[PDB]
């Protein structure tokens, strides 16, 4: 893209994720938005990206986002491909290494999403003048 490849592939990967989600976000997770009270986008994308690595791969078998039979295994599989394909992207977007979680609140996966891509879509105004 004009702006950035990234970019470009992050909100695709992402669109995709609630393009055609399930009932998966019954379930909490971190909400590190909630704690922005002093830091960057560098350190969100660190933690978030941190997050949502473990989340998935310790998730992998939880049999709690299941919620149904193996129907959910094989929908998951691609899934959790597009996880880490994005949290890959921020991973190297974010410009540094690795950052700890901290802990705040909890919200409900569809709202992570949004979050992320209501900034990513903020940011993604400075492309056309």
């Given at each position: 893209?004009?702006?950035?490849?990234?970019?470009?592939?992050?909100i695709?990967?992402?669109?995709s994720?609630?393009?055609q989600?399930?009932?998966?976000?019954?379930?909490?997770?971190?909400?590190?938005?909630?704690?922005?009270?002093?830091?960057?986008?560098?350190?969100?994308?660190?933690?978030?990206?941190?997050?949502?690595?473990?989340?998935y791969?310790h998730?992998?078998?939880?049999?709690?986002?299941?919620?149904?039979?193996?129907?959910?295994?094989?929908?998951?599989k691609?899934?959790?491909?597009?996880?880490?394909?994005?949290?890959?992207?921020?991973?190297?977007?974010?410009?540094?290494?690795?950052?700890?979680?901290?802990?705040?609140?909890?919200?409900?996966?569809?709202?992570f999403?949004?979050?992320?891509?209501?900034?990513?879509?903020?940011?993604?105004?400075?492309?056309?003048?």
């Open positions: 893209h004009k702006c950035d490849i990234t970019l470009q592939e992050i695709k990967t992402l669109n994720l609630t393009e989600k399930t009932l998966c976000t019954e379930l909490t997770v971190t909400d590190i938005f909630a704690a922005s009270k002093n830091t960057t986008e560098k350190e969100t994308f660190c933690r978030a990206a941190t997050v949502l690595r473990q989340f791969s998730h992998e078998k939880d049999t709690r986002c299941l919620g149904a039979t193996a129907q959910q295994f094989h929908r998951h691609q899934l959790i491909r597009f996880l880490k394909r994005l949290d890959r992207n921020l991973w190297g977007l974010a410009g540094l290494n690795s950052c700890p979680v901290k802990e705040a609140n909890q919200s409900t996966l569809e709202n999403l949004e979050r992320l891509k209501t900034i990513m879509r903020e940011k993604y105004s400075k492309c056309s003048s």
